[PDB]
DNA sequence: AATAAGCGGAAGTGGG
DNA sequence: CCCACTTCGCTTAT
């Protein structure tokens, strides 16, 4: 199955959704939620992993926190606002 | 109080 | 048993 940075950034990259994620800086590969349709776009996760429950956003970015130590998406100090690693990004 | 964003421990569940 | 997530209490700022 798809891991989830590479969901997001599949979505950044064919604009899909682009109501609930899009790039701040593309280069540096900071990325944004929408406060208010944020929903959707978990929802759309979990769908697309089959899971048990309906994916909600806080679900999806306690997932993202895990990233934080391995490093493929860290938090950014700005509002609902993350940063793929360089080495996400040029794969 | 209310609310949205943000955190991390911990047990559960996947993995041709 | 770890991967790679998946499913409260706490905390801060408005």
Known sequence: KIRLY???LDLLRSGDMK???????????????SSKHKEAL?????????NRKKMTYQKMAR?????????????????????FSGEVLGR
Not at 65 to 81: C, F, H, P, Q
């Open 19 to 33: 109501d609930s994620i899009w790039w701040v800086d593309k280069d540096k590969g900071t990325f944004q939620f």
């Open 42 to 50: 978990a929802h759309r996760w979990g769908i697309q992993k089959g």
């Open 6 to 8: 590479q969901f997001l």
């Open 63 to 83: 997932a993202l926190r895990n990233y934080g130590k391995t490093g493929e998406v860290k938090k950014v100090k700005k509002k609902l606002t993350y940063q």
